[PDB]
């Protein structure tokens with residue numbers, strides 16, 4: 388795995404700091420923070436205020452989130468700078484204590500990219516709880532790329548991209564901190580996810596990989612948004628956050644938790660917002676930036692994707 392010093396940031400610190408917010412606290416002084424990393428086409432609040440912001444609060448954490456502009460549609464490598472900066476800030480701001488990271492969709496890819504290429508945060512992240520992470524990207528973005536209607540981060544999240552290749556070759560498909568991955572075979576955004584094996588996009592070696600259908604059966608259906616908001620997802624997430632091993636425990640969930648509806652502890656208002664979670668994301672992607680090539684890899688990642696093609700040309704170290 389990459390070692391040594393962290394690569395330099397491309398964005399100024401004041402800009403990176405501006406993308407971090409905590410509920411009822413400044414990042415410089417916060418009690419038991421949990422860092423939430425949003426999905427493609429959303430801001431932190433859009434991804435989590437109908438679900439894990441109120442739910443993590445009820446578990447004793449102070450939710451904090453990053454909102455890389457515009458709506459996580461830009462270069463995933465830059466989105467990661469927001470996360471690395473945030474971990475550095477929240478670790479110090481909480482009395483030099485490790486903190487958990489909880490993610491949805493692209494957020495999981497951002498977290499794993501950060502842990503792989505920025506060594507300094509490895510001892511600052513307590514555990515990772517990723518919902519519907521696309522570590523190997525998704526094959527469904529292929530046609531959008533070919534139609535030239537894909538945002539920078541959509542190109543990068545396409546299976547076979549230079550970015551996903553670099554992650555794999557650097558050793559990023561094995562967990563770095565205790566990780567739990569919750570995903571669904573019926574995900575309509577991230578595929579392939581149907582094998583319940585290392586071939587799935589959400590799978591990490593040595594991680595606690597939980598495909599919903601492996602527990603609840605082939606007739607259990609939860610979509611991309613439901614992977615984050617369902618009652619089943621809540622039970623697994625709570626297990627991961629409370630676990631002494633840093634990963635969700637099988638003894639903590641079962642058949643009776645196979646409920647696809649939004650988490651029981653959410654208020655009626657929060658449940659309505661959670662049900663329509665994907666609406667703002669769909670709108671942001673259609674209105675957002677689009678290009679006809681994958682963004683170039685930063686210097687620190689180039690040696691791990693030699694031979695791939697990005698906007699500027701063929702990747703060389």
Ligand SMILES: *[C@@H]1O[C@H](CO)[C@@H](O[C@@H]2O[C@H](CO)[C@@H](O)[C@H](O)[C@H]2NC(C)=O)[C@H](O)[C@H]1NC(C)=O
Nearest residue numbers: 397398455456457461462464465466539682683
């Ligand atoms: C979106 O991502 C691009 C590419 O990472 C960022 O552009 C780079 O910014 C740094 C710092 O200004 C420059 O050194 C690079 O030359 C830029 N690269 C390109 C390809 O232009 C850009 O800053 C990001 N935008 C936002 C809003 O985060």
